[PDB]
Amino acid sequence: QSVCAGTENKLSSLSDLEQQYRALRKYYENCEVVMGNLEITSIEHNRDLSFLRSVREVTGYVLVALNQFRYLPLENLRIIRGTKLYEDRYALAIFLNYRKDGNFGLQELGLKNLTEILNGGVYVDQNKFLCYADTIHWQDIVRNPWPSNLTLVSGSSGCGRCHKSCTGRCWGPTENHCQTLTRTVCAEQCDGRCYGPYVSDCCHRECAGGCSGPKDTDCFACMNFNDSGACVTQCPQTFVYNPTTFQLEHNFNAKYTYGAFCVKKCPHNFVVDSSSCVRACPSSKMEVEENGIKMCKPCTDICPKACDGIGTGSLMSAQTVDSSNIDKFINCTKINGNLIFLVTGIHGDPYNAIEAIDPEKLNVFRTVREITGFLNIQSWPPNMTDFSVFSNLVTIGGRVLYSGLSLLILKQQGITSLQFQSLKEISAGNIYITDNSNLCYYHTINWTTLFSTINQRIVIRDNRKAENCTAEGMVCNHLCSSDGCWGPGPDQCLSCRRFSRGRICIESCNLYDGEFREFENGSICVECDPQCEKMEDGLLTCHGPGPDNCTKCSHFKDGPNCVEKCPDIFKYADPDRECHPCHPNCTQGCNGPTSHDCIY
Amino acid sequence: QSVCAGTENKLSSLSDLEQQYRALRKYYENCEVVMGNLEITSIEHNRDLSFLRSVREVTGYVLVALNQFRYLPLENLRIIRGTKLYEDRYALAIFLNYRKDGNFGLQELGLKNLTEILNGGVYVDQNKFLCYADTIHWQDIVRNPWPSNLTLVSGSSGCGRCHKSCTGRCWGPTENHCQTLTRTVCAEQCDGRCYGPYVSDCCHRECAGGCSGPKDTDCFACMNFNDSGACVTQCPQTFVYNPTTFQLEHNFNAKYTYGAFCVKKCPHNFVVDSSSCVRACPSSKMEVEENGIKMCKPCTDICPKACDGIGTGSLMSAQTVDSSNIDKFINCTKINGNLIFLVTGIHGDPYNAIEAIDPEKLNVFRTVREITGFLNIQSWPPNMTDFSVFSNLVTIGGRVLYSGLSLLILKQQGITSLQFQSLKEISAGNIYITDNSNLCYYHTINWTTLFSTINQRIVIRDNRKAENCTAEGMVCNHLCSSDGCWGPGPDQCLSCRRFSRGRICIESCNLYDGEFREFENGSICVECDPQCEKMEDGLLTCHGPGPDNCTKCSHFKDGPNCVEKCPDGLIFKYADPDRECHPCHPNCTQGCNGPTSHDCI
Amino acid sequence: SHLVKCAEKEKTFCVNGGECFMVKDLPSRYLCKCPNEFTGDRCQNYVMAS
Amino acid sequence: SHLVKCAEKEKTFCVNGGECFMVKDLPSRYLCKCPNEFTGDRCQNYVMAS
Ligand SMILES: *[C@@H]1O[C@H](CO)[C@@H](O[C@@H]2O[C@H](CO)[C@@H](O[C@@H]3O[C@H](CO[C@H]4O[C@H](CO)[C@@H](O)[C@H](O)[C@@H]4O)[C@@H](O)[C@H](O[C@H]4O[C@H](CO)[C@@H](O)[C@H](O)[C@@H]4O)[C@@H]3O)[C@H](O)[C@H]2NC(C)=O)[C@H](O)[C@H]1NC(C)=O
Ligand SMILES: *[C@@H]1O[C@H](CO)[C@@H](O[C@@H]2O[C@H](CO)[C@@H](O[C@@H]3O[C@H](CO[C@H]4O[C@H](CO)[C@@H](O)[C@H](O)[C@@H]4O)[C@@H](O)[C@H](O[C@H]4O[C@H](CO)[C@@H](O)[C@H](O)[C@@H]4O)[C@@H]3O)[C@H](O)[C@H]2NC(C)=O)[C@H](O)[C@H]1NC(C)=O
Ligand SMILES: *[C@@H]1O[C@H](CO)[C@@H](O[C@@H]2O[C@H](CO)[C@@H](O[C@@H]3O[C@H](CO[C@H]4O[C@H](CO)[C@@H](O)[C@H](O)[C@@H]4O)[C@@H](O)[C@H](O[C@H]4O[C@H](CO)[C@@H](O)[C@H](O)[C@@H]4O)[C@@H]3O)[C@H](O)[C@H]2NC(C)=O)[C@H](O)[C@H]1NC(C)=O
Ligand SMILES: *[C@@H]1O[C@H](CO)[C@@H](O[C@@H]2O[C@H](CO)[C@@H](O[C@@H]3O[C@H](CO[C@H]4O[C@H](CO)[C@@H](O)[C@H](O)[C@@H]4O)[C@@H](O)[C@H](O[C@H]4O[C@H](CO)[C@@H](O)[C@H](O)[C@@H]4O)[C@@H]3O)[C@H](O)[C@H]2NC(C)=O)[C@H](O)[C@H]1NC(C)=O
Ligand SMILES: *[C@@H]1O[C@H](CO)[C@@H](O[C@@H]2O[C@H](CO)[C@@H](O[C@@H]3O[C@H](CO[C@H]4O[C@H](CO)[C@@H](O)[C@H](O)[C@@H]4O)[C@@H](O)[C@H](O[C@H]4O[C@H](CO)[C@@H](O)[C@H](O)[C@@H]4O)[C@@H]3O)[C@H](O)[C@H]2NC(C)=O)[C@H](O)[C@H]1NC(C)=O
Ligand SMILES: *[C@@H]1O[C@H](CO)[C@@H](O[C@@H]2O[C@H](CO)[C@@H](O[C@@H]3O[C@H](CO[C@H]4O[C@H](CO)[C@@H](O)[C@H](O)[C@@H]4O)[C@@H](O)[C@H](O[C@H]4O[C@H](CO)[C@@H](O)[C@H](O)[C@@H]4O)[C@@H]3O)[C@H](O)[C@H]2NC(C)=O)[C@H](O)[C@H]1NC(C)=O
Ligand SMILES: *[C@@H]1O[C@H](CO)[C@@H](O[C@@H]2O[C@H](CO)[C@@H](O[C@@H]3O[C@H](CO[C@H]4O[C@H](CO)[C@@H](O)[C@H](O)[C@@H]4O)[C@@H](O)[C@H](O)[C@@H]3O)[C@H](O)[C@H]2NC(C)=O)[C@H](O)[C@H]1NC(C)=O
Ligand SMILES: *[C@@H]1O[C@H](CO)[C@@H](O[C@@H]2O[C@H](CO)[C@@H](O[C@@H]3O[C@H](CO)[C@@H](O)[C@H](O)[C@@H]3O)[C@H](O)[C@H]2NC(C)=O)[C@H](O)[C@H]1NC(C)=O
Ligand SMILES: *[C@@H]1O[C@H](CO)[C@@H](O[C@@H]2O[C@H](CO)[C@@H](O[C@@H]3O[C@H](CO)[C@@H](O)[C@H](O)[C@@H]3O)[C@H](O)[C@H]2NC(C)=O)[C@H](O)[C@H]1NC(C)=O
Ligand SMILES: *[C@@H]1O[C@H](CO)[C@@H](O[C@@H]2O[C@H](CO)[C@@H](O[C@@H]3O[C@H](CO)[C@@H](O)[C@H](O)[C@@H]3O)[C@H](O)[C@H]2NC(C)=O)[C@H](O)[C@H]1NC(C)=O
Ligand SMILES: *[C@@H]1O[C@H](CO)[C@@H](O[C@@H]2O[C@H](CO)[C@@H](O[C@@H]3O[C@H](CO)[C@@H](O)[C@H](O)[C@@H]3O)[C@H](O)[C@H]2NC(C)=O)[C@H](O)[C@H]1NC(C)=O
Ligand SMILES: *[C@@H]1O[C@H](CO)[C@@H](O[C@@H]2O[C@H](CO)[C@@H](O)[C@H](O)[C@H]2NC(C)=O)[C@H](O)[C@H]1NC(C)=O
Ligand SMILES: *[C@@H]1O[C@H](CO)[C@@H](O)[C@H](O)[C@H]1NC(C)=O
Ligand SMILES: *[C@@H]1O[C@H](CO)[C@@H](O)[C@H](O)[C@H]1NC(C)=O
């Protein structure tokens, strides 16, 4: 099935009515499952809405609220699930669709197939020119339809009656488009819905709207999980209980639950728990990976911090980081959810009495190593020229996306460089970085090396021209390799052509000079034992980290190592500073192998 | 509903035909669900079998062989589950039920309610006098409806035909004795079974044998699990997956699976795993107790040695501990299963070439702390007078019971005392100790103190007379409490008054006397820190385990504590003529004499 | 039009240059029109393309 | 009259003094007759009361 996503504009619109229609085409054209709200706002009477005929299923509410069109082309819409409701009340709300100064408005509803509404109410009101809506048998369509669940129809003007073969229940004047009943007409021996009043013409209990036959694989839509064409309440799990032996046995038919479907495999960034795939593991268990599969198990005395992101957990009512919630990130290495920085968060929100963020408060994010969702930056304080607040970020999980994006940076004007250090992987989704007219270093990064699949891409346009950035000297350190870089400093490159120490790429190591001494390695140099002699003239003594590795030490020599003092049998130093055992009965001090050599 | 445990002895019987009839009454009278097998053998003609009419469900197989009676009165039997099969093939086996030297035998089967056999096949053979069992359409009853699939249906000619209302397919000579078909008559759109030829008269998927309506609460027998009258594939779990938030969210109607039924809570002696009640946890995980609930979680890098018992796991084919399997218990601390000692395990089994057990091999059980099933001892080496090989056993779990028993000891004349020592709890089931004619101390023990519910009882019947054991002085230590004892020693009592010193009971702990000094509270005594000086002249030495808990120490004082030599290592210290330690000036670790740099080396 | 302008006491209900309006029906309901570079119920988010 | 005695090579089948029989059928079957004190397919278990 072709799957799109719904908008969250409700009654709001763009000031140009043609851009509002063009947006409606881009969101809902050539899809059949909406995965969100379906909402049609402020469309003119001359515009072509026939593209909406591909819609068959809506998971949120349907809203048709200020439009001037004559016919609503949704005749093949079968089911509305009501996941979110308009005003928290309604799954289908149709109102005010007429022009008060004339005769233009909504006259007929193309909803012949709308048979099941699983949650919320139905509201049809103030549609002055609407003809047949009070004849629709909404208590067959709506699940639990009684007045306390808000099922109501008011249009005020008169209109001609429909054909007699449909007995006063119609969508239009013709017998071809009138009411079908599948819940209030069924014989009392069957539950759910039917395709005829007879007991033999009733369908499976776990199917929605209607059916072609009695099977759980031969129905139009359902309120439960899709197990390979069958509609079922639960699907086979990893283990099944043996009622004779009182033990759990492994199930060769086991499937994982993922969204509305039962699957054999889950996404590479989702966690597998109790035969299902989830966006995050609960705080009582630690996330682990075995055989390439992410799972979680009960944690030890020290566990990962239970720190939530925007839109999930304790912050579900929030749509941005702001002055009322930024303190929750003070001690936080892993944020479970999104990071979203809007204009109403950075600069405050006077309507809700929320103050602006003090730029110093943004330092709470310097501890973060992982984001499980996406990072979305639309506003950042004017005084800040970079993102060095996130220098320690290692990866973006991308388990949830913003319009398919996992990293999104829009229209920042005070920014000149990115300044990340630790970021290595962006595990899912695309990158969108645009309109940053003063940002330079973006053209020096091999962005493909951050992705976990060839299906991930980056979009860049309208940032500072690379030829101007080079001409102005806004370039990376001379040690940087072809992998790329994101700032002027020796620590700002992804990988370098010489040695390194800590976070800084370097020209040479402290091998033959310095107050401390190092040994060579593949792309880094590391200090050896502090006892090791600091020899001159290129005569390097560090060849590995171990006390046993050093070729000459200033302290007392022994077999496995050197020591500042030898063991108390007592061992005594020779003229070459090597320690040798004394007499077996001497422990206090000595200068020789026999009894008269013992010293106190 | 009344449940009985059935039998597992195949064609074997008691040699006395009156005792074989009485045993049949004792096992199967006044029960409806037969766990294990239903098996009727060698019963005489003119015996009353009308008590078998209460049976409706059999879990294993039904076996009827070598009997002389005319009619088999199983008129209410509905389903045979077939969890075990006769010869590993047959769920229902009826054969040889006649006398070849006369005219007695089985003629009619009272089986007209039997409409479901879930596993195996049917064997009806060599019965000389059966009239109607050969007319039955047995493919409507079995879940494997093929003539070649573990099935044979053979009786003599000359018996009258089925009643005129029936197309053959009858159980008896007249009306109301015809076969009711529930699988072969159903509409082609129907799953499972039906109660009419129309698609409108078909039953729910989960119902067995037959039905009265299409609902999961309106049928005769249930497949899989029974959720308070509703027949289901599985019960509601602790969490439900949310298809729009992509998370596991807590359920409000969750139930634990417990055998064939679903319950609000597991029994107190069972462990919880994945919203179900199980007898034992897999070897990769530990069982733990949190908030009084037993649950199972992954183990650490070094974890306890779980071990298979008799009748489960690697020992599933075993009936007793014996000389072949005794080597598998060497480092076991927790046995997941039963521990059983039969005559064939202890004294050998020449038919299978198994030698008698060496009494020294039994010492492998001295490390065991818990048995999760029952302990059943019917034989013991003749030269062992007690069970001291189990002195480290602490709990009998009772998750599996022997006809309701969790501790069973029968007919052993070599035993004079029990001598358990560490045993504190018997979590479920009854205790049965009888016929042990030389055993004394059984009568002193306060047996209700070992139980975890008011439903537990002990059966004492014919052990050595308590008055005769008293006359011979076979009584416990003067210091032991009214709770009784396991044997004559000072360390073999259930509880004792005054104090104990580990497992041994004592009147006092010498707080101001003797070769040792220790502190006491709560009827337990524990040694004091050995660096403390021993006090004399009636003075108490130690108030607790710490060096700050005693009157004086030979070691130096260092605040409240005591220290071997404060000038060793370290910050640095000296100590005074009263043996109290004090700080020296910094950079004096080579040696010092006082609270200054001016006396340092 | 079924819409009327919001009173000054509801200022900043719609942000980033959007114009607040009220639906004339009874509770009353609130919306805004805004420039092509913003969207969302209060016009708080950027419109994204290409 | 459907049973015969076990041959000497089979008489050790039944354990606690029970008499061993073979069924005259083809794939032959064994059973034994236990004393009143014993039960089980080979007479290996004690019979219990109360
Ligand atoms: C209101 O809702 C109804 C019910 O859901 C919709 O009706 C469906 O219409 C579609 C499209 O025509 C049907 O799908 C097609 O089914 C064919 C199989 O035969 C059907 O019809 C016979 C009786 O005539 C039945 O016995 C049988 O069970 C089936 O129901 C297939 O051959 C078709 O495949 C071909 O077309 C597709 C098109 O995408 C191609 O991809 C294939 O390659 C192939 O060429 C197709 O699958 C569907 O079965 C109808 N359902 C029912 C129950 O009739 C209405 O469309 C909707 N209202 C409006 C206004 O659209
Ligand atoms: C349970 O889950 C299963 C599996 O996901 C769902 O099965 C889907 O069935 C729908 C139709 O109901 C399919 O959608 C349509 O498929 C057509 C192509 O089908 C061919 O290719 C597939 C393999 O890719 C073959 O299996 C199949 O036999 C065909 O050969 C498209 O042509 C359709 O799109 C066109 O028509 C629409 C009409 O509105 C236009 O809008 C489009 O622009 C386009 O022109 C359409 O996509 C879907 O492919 C099936 N999935 C699979 C994987 O088989 C069940 O529907 C689901 N629920 C239930 C209740 O069973
Ligand atoms: C100064 O420091 C340098 C390092 O900077 C030292 O270099 C050592 O080089 C030797 C080889 O010359 C290394 O030894 C080899 O290590 C391999 C890896 O072993 C690890 O991984 C396996 C994984 O299964 C573990 O089993 C194992 O325990 C280790 O954790 C081994 O595979 C090699 O074994 C093979 O060679 C030996 C040779 O004797 C055979 O006996 C074996 O059968 C087998 O064929 C081998 O052990 C060593 O690890 C390096 N050390 C370090 C620290 O990197 C210099 O030696 C050192 N100089 C001085 C003066 O000390
Ligand atoms: C073969 O197997 C069948 C199926 O299991 C048995 O058939 C039934 O026999 C039982 C009794 O053994 C019957 O149960 C009793 O039925 C009485 C009448 O019920 C009416 O209402 C129900 C509503 O669902 C209808 O289905 C039914 O047709 C009747 O119209 C009830 O009054 C009884 O309950 C009362 O008495 C008991 C006494 O202990 C109380 O505990 C109760 O609380 C209550 O007051 C009882 O339910 C059963 O109805 C019969 N079923 C059918 C389909 O006929 C055969 O007995 C069995 N064996 C043989 C040899 O035939
Ligand atoms: C799914 O699981 C449910 C339970 O969750 C099962 O329900 C059982 O239903 C059977 C009947 O089909 C019940 O058995 C009968 O109960 C009668 C009433 O006894 C109860 O109520 C009195 C109230 O005072 C209590 O004193 C008593 O302790 C019980 O709690 C009895 O009268 C019946 O026995 C009589 O008839 C038989 C002969 O038929 C005689 O042998 C008896 O001596 C006696 O005269 C009978 O016991 C049973 O109690 C129900 N159980 C529960 C827990 O409710 C479903 O059967 C099950 N479904 C399937 C398909 O498996
Ligand atoms: C020298 O000898 C003395 C005794 O003469 C020893 O002192 C006792 O030591 C025990 C521990 O071994 C102490 O017990 C613990 O006390 C804690 C404090 O609570 C008590 O004191 C406050 C004082 O205001 C009272 O309000 C309160 O009612 C108690 O009386 C408790 O916190 C401990 O248990 C609780 O907390 C733990 C936290 O992990 C939980 O696990 C427990 O479940 C429980 O909730 C515990 O009870 C005892 O208080 C000491 N007694 C005295 C008199 O001080 C010295 O220890 C000994 N020296 C050496 C070195 O051994
Ligand atoms: C974020 O995590 C921090 C831990 O990583 C939380 O704790 C703070 O950690 C710092 C750094 O370790 C501490 O500062 C040190 O304090 C000691 C003195 O501590 C002792 O004395 C105080 C007296 O009040 C007493 O409360 C303590 O228990 C100790 O006995 C100094 O010697 C160090 O030089 C250094 O200053 C903080 O004290 C510590 N705070 C607390 C409240 O424990 C931190 O709170 C976390 N922040 C948030 C917002 O969650
Ligand atoms: C940016 O990152 C990409 C992806 O890691 C780098 O692409 C890689 O290019 C190398 C060098 O061309 C490929 O290796 C080999 O190259 C030689 C020719 O030099 C060729 O003969 C071999 O057959 C082989 O292709 C390597 O496969 C390739 N990796 C991928 C995944 O395409 C790229 O070099 C990085 N840097 C820049 C500046 O693009
Ligand atoms: C010299 O440089 C090499 C790399 O060129 C260093 O070898 C690396 O050692 C690290 C030690 O942490 C290895 O990390 C591993 O990470 C996984 C993460 O799951 C962890 O499970 C392992 O226990 C392990 O810590 C890393 O694999 C290894 N890399 C290679 C290529 O072998 C080496 O440590 C450097 N030596 C010095 C003195 O710094
Ligand atoms: C075997 O051990 C059990 C358990 O310790 C002993 O049972 C206990 O008997 C005493 C005396 O009858 C009970 O104390 C009484 O309790 C009632 C509670 O309402 C109270 O009103 C009385 O004033 C008195 O305190 C005690 O509850 C009872 N414990 C239990 C758990 O039942 C039993 O005496 C021991 N038998 C032998 C052989 O000593
Ligand atoms: C003096 O009194 C102390 C308590 O103040 C006695 O020690 C306590 O002994 C009990 C057992 O009798 C311990 O409780 C048990 O702990 C285990 C830990 O795994 C747990 O599994 C049991 O459920 C139970 O809670 C208790 O921990 C222990 N307390 C201390 C402080 O060690 C002591 O025996 C008395 N006598 C002497 C002379 O010490
Ligand atoms: C950094 O913030 C400071 C204010 O805290 C800004 O500095 C002021 O800018 C105005 C511009 O009209 C000047 O009139 C003031 O004299 C400045 N004050 C000081 C103390 O210098 C500054 O512009 C901010 N920088 C950025 C890049 O936003
Ligand atoms: C870019 O650089 C050129 C000189 O190379 C200069 O003429 C031009 O004005 C610069 N553009 C901007 C936007 O500063
Ligand atoms: C009691 O013990 C004596 C010991 O001589 C024994 O002869 C007698 O049979 C015993 N009687 C009973 C009833 O235990």
Author numbering:
A (entry chain B): 26 to 179, 182 to 595, 604 to 635
B (entry chain A): 26 to 179, 182 to 597, 604 to 634
C (entry chain D), D (entry chain C): 177 to 202, 205 to 228
Sentences from the paper on this structure:
Human Epidermal growth factor Receptor 4 (HER4 or ERBB4) carries out essential functions in the development and maintenance of the cardiovascular and nervous systems. HER4 activation is regulated by a diverse group of extracellular ligands including the neuregulin (NRG) family and betacellulin (BTC), which promote HER4 homodimerization or heterodimerization with other HER receptors. Important cardiovascular functions of HER4 are exerted via heterodimerization with its close homolog and orphan receptor, HER2. Here, we report cryo-EM structures of near full-length HER2/HER4 heterodimers and full-length HER4 homodimers bound to NRG1β and BTC.
To test this hypothesis for HER4 complexes, we determined the cryo-EM structures of full-length HER4 homodimers bound to NRG1β or BTC. In both structures, HER4 kinase domains were bound to afatinib to enable high-resolution reconstruction in the ECD module (3.4 Å for NRG1β, and 3.7 Å for BTC). As observed in a previous HER4/NRG1β crystal structure of isolated ECDs, liganded HER4 assembles into homodimers with near-perfect C2 symmetry. The two receptors in the HER4/NRG1β dimer adopt an angle of 37 degrees compared to 33 degrees for HER4/BTC. Detailed 3D classification analysis revealed substantial scissor-like movements around the dimerization arm in both data sets with the concerted intermonomer movement of domains I and IV, varying from 35 to 39 degrees for HER4/NRG1β and 30–35 degrees for HER4/BTC. While both pockets bury a similar surface area (NRG1β: 2967–3068 A2, BTC: 3142–3163 A2), the HER4/NRG1β pocket is characterized by a larger network of ionic interactions. In the HER4/NRG1β pocket, HER4 K438, K35, E112 and D376 form salt bridges with NRG1β E215, D219, R207 and R220, respectively. Most remarkably, at lower contour levels, our HER4 maps show continuous cryo-EM density connecting the two receptor monomers originating from N548 and N576 on domain IV of one receptor monomer and N358 on domain III of the other receptor involving sugar moieties beyond the core glycan trees of 4–5 sugars. Indeed, 3D classification of the particles in our final reconstruction uncovered at least one class with more defined N548-N576-N358 glycan networks in the dimer interface. Thus, our analysis of the HER4/NRG1β homodimer cryo-EM density uncovers an important role of receptor glycosylation in stabilizing the active HER4 monomer by bridging its two distal domains, domain II and IV and domains I and II, and likely both monomers within the HER4 homodimer through direct inter-receptor connections.
